[PDB]
């Protein structure tokens, strides 16, 4: 048995002459998140989460 | 038997000169997630949410 | 019997003459995350998460 | 049994002509995570979070 | 029974005329996490974590 | 029974004309972790850590 | 005046689990050419013929 | 005056699992060119060509 | 002026178990070039080329 | 007036469990070429040529 | 004047459990070849030629 | 005026666990060339060539 979770593969990706401005005055900003996993067993799991 | 759960694969991207602007005075701003996986055997669980 | 959990493999990236500017003044601010795998068993398990 | 959990391989990256500029007054700023794998077994586990 | 956790490997990078630059006035600024890897049996792990 | 943990292997880089500038008044900045591996039994285990 | 002639650039590709079989027993076979870009002032140019 | 000619840049690929397999018995074969550049001022200027 | 001729930069490429088999008689196989650059002010220039 | 010719900079390839075999019997067999410059002034210039 | 010909720099490569078997009965076999630069200034110039 | 030929600089690899087999009956084998840099004022030069 052969059980794949949360798996990311095979990404290619070409970033040219992107510009990018962020500004924060209070809160939480979240921002650019690429090829990411995770795996929780128990508990809350959260992936770019601002709050 | 092969479970797959949460899987992303074979993603080709290309951007060319893309400009993001930002601007934050309170809460939360989430942005720009790509080829995210995630799997939660309990508890809540998001993804880019913004509370 | 295979598992395979928050597995990232296979990412090939090119960023030419990409800009950022990140200003903070409260709060939290998290951005650039890639290629990031995290297994938690058990507790709460976050990724690029502000709060 | 083989078990893989949190793991990276073949990443292949090249960045060129990258300008990056970070002002903080108060808080937290988290950036440029690449790379990167956890395993807790107990306990919160977090990877680029700001709070 | 061959168990890999928080294994990184095969990775390659180039990096050429690369700028960063980082302004702290208070708080906590964490920045370029390249191949790391951590296992904690137990208590919080934390990976680039800015409070 | 082989175990791997923490584990980082096979890393070549290649730096040239890498500009950093960190001015610091006041808090933490941590910047420039590469190739690092932790296994923590017990107690609470942190990596590039700024608080 | 900025003059690009024969420029080939921005070109992410995922190829996974292709086969490719090749017989020849006389003459000239040609194949898979990818971002090829060539310039000739004088004489003839010729990519990817087969006579 | 800026001019470029037979250029190519910002190439990011991926293969996995790729089988090729090539029999040859008379003649020529030519397979697999990838990010190929070539400037010629005078002559015949040829690219995978198979005669 | 700056002119720029025959240049190839920023590849990122990732192989992962691709298997290759080339059986040769007679004539001539050319293959798996990659990332060639080549600049001839006069007489035939040729890359790959089998005759 | 600064000119290149023939450049190749920038390259980070990974290869993992790549099979190659080559069988020859007569003939020329050319394969594996990487990361290859060359400028002739004059005469016949030829990169991974095989007759 | 900053003139550059057959230059290569910033290359960073990773092999890993990488088999190769060549069997040559007659002819000239070529392979292998990696960051190799020439500069001829009169006279045929070939690189990882077979004939 | 800086001139720069055949010049190769910055060069990283790392491998493990490679295994190379040549087994030559007649003509000429050539294999392995790495991080190689020649200027040849007159006559025919050669790098990696089997005849």
Same mark, same amino acid.
């Given at each position: 048995?052969?059980?794949?979770?949360? /798996? %990311?593969? #095979? &990404?290619?990706? $070409? =970033?040219? @002459? *992107?510009? !990018?401005?962020?500004?924060?005055?209070?809160? +939480? /900003? %979240?921002? #650019? &998140?690429?090829? $990411? =996993?995770? @795996? *929780?067993? !128990?508990?809350?799991?959260?992936?770019?989460? +601002?709050?």
């Amino acid at each position: 048995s052969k059980t794949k979770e949360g /798996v %990311v593969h #095979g &990404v290619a990706t $070409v =970033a040219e @002459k *992107t510009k !990018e401005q962020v500004t924060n005055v209070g809160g +939480a /900003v %979240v921002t #650019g &998140v690429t090829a $990411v =996993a995770q @795996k *929780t067993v !128990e508990g809350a799991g959260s992936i770019a989460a +601002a709050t």
